Amino acid sequence: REHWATRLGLILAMAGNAVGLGNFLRFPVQAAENGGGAFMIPYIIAFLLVGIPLMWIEWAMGRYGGAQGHGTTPAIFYLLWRNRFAKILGVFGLWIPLVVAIYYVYIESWTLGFAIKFLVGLVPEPTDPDSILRPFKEFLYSYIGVPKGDEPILKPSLFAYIVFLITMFINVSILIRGISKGIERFAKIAMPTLFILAVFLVIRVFLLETPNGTAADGLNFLWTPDFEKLKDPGVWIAAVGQIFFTLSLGFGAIITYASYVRKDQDIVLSGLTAATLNEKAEVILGGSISIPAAVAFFGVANAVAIAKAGAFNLGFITLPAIFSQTAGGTFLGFLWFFLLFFAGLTSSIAIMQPMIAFLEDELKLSRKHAVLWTAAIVFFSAHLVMFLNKSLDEMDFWAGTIGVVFFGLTELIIFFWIFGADKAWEEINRGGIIKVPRIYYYVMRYITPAFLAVLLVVWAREHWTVWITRFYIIGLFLFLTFLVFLAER
Numbered sequence: 001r002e003h004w005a006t007r008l009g010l011i012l013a014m015a016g017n018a019v020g021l022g023n024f025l026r027f028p029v030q031a032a033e034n035g036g037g038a039f040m041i042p043y044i045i046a047f048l049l050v051g052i053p054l055m056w057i058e059w060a061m062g063r064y065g066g067a068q069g070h071g072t073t074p075a076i077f078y079l080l081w082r083n084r085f086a087k088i089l090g091v092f093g094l095w096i097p098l099v100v101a102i103y104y105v106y107i108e109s110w111t112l113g114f115a116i117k118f119l120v121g122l123v124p125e126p127t128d129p130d131s132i133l134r135p136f137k138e139f140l141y142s143y144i145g146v147p148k149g150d151e152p153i154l155k156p157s158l159f160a161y162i163v164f165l166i167t168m169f170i171n172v173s174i175l176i177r178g179i180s181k182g183i184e185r186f187a188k189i190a191m192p193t194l195f196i197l198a199v200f201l202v203i204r205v206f207l208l209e210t211p212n213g214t215a216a217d218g219l220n221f222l223w224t225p226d227f228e229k230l231k232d233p234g235v236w237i238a239a240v241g242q243i244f245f246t247l248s249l250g251f252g253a254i255i256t257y258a259s260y261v262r263k264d265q266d267i268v269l270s271g272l273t274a275a276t277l278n279e280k281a282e283v284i285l286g287g288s289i290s291i292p293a294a295v296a297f298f299g300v301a302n303a304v305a306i307a308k309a310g311a312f313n314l315g316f317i318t319l320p321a322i323f324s325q326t327a328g329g330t331f332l333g334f335l336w337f338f339l340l341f342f343a344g345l346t347s348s349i350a351i352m353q354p355m356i357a358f359l360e361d362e363l364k365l366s367r368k369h370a371v372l373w374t375a376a377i378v379f380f381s382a383h384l385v386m387f388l389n390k391s392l393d394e395m396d397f398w399a400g401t402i403g404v405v406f407f408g409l410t411e412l413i414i415f416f417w418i419f420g421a422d423k424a425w426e427e428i429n430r431g432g433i434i435k436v437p438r439i440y441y442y443v444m445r446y447i448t449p450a451f452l453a454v455l456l457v458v459w460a461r462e463h464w465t466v467w468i469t470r471f472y473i474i475g476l477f478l479f480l481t482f483l484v485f486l487a488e489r
Ligand SMILES: CC(C)C[C@H](N)C(=O)O
Pocket: 017, 018, 019, 020, 021, 022, 023, 100, 245, 246, 247, 248, 251, 347, 348, 350, 351
């Protein structure tokens, strides 16, 4: 079996798994909508009670399965629970990363296309907030193919489509070279580049002074607390969902990556380091860039408006408009979209590896054929997201939101209840440079599952292109269940 070459490459590849588009696009809008500075209270609680424990559990399950030649949850769940229904539940560990990859790689291709257009200065150039934002709203809509009327259909530009092809080619170019010579070698270059880009952008944003406000006014707006809405269960659901997404928990990606860690290698300190690096990039770097620069340029009055506009409006419309209004801002735009691209790329290769690992481990396919077939399924399926509006939202909800929380509870129960709390605890701490604090044993066994279960219950008591997407992703689950059937025989 393939293995990571170095401990540094392992940590940077896992950090690249976590540090993605959610750090810079999702997190700022999540915090602004769910209490501002007060959002850190449920965010930190979810990080300590759910994020950290589930991270170590997924590292352990992956390495445990990897020692027996299995990198994906259908086989690994069966190894932990000799029951056919454990294999069916394990299919979610392939379905979730595949469905998420379908729309994640498309958004990733947007950042590459915007990086290209901004590097060469093929950007619009406009006084008034709406007068400055309109040319960039139309720039994104022409790139995406937004309808002029009520039609719910998208028609991407030829440039966007070709850039999506290039994006798939780049993901294949990394993934086809394997774990050490592909993912690990690219992580050692991309992650240092990522942090340098982000730190530089934070510094440049903290120097913004406009007639409407300063960077300090933007930081004040973002971290303005609103502790009253901590009574809203939706804030706690948003915080837990953000923790799942930003740490790549419940996507089967950590498990597959950890399956290439040697049996006796540390996973306690490595996983803690990767999770810590992500939180630094998320709350320190991701939070400091987009929203503060937006408030600094459009003032606090317009800040509430663009905060409610959404992550895509903020990342692909509002921030580009700001850039075009500063000296050398087209290059700042390039660095922004270059940052997002490497952040997305290091995450998309992680979210496509589970399907590659399943084809290699269980169907005995070569790496070349496993990578090319995985890319083909993702490329084809992405035409749903490319041409159908609201298709991405449905996939992100079922797979990247509800699915990951249900799967996080499932892998927890299988590993720590059915397999054995004492056995799982021994499996986590084995080989660890540091040991897990004893209090987390009771957190994993009682607190985390009770927290997730109550959230599930509280979550349940709170067009027709949607049925097209539902139909398709249901078929994907049927397809993957058939491949698991074929792997048995
Ligand atoms: C699906 C995951 C790869 C998402 C990634 N952890 C992010 O924060 O963007």
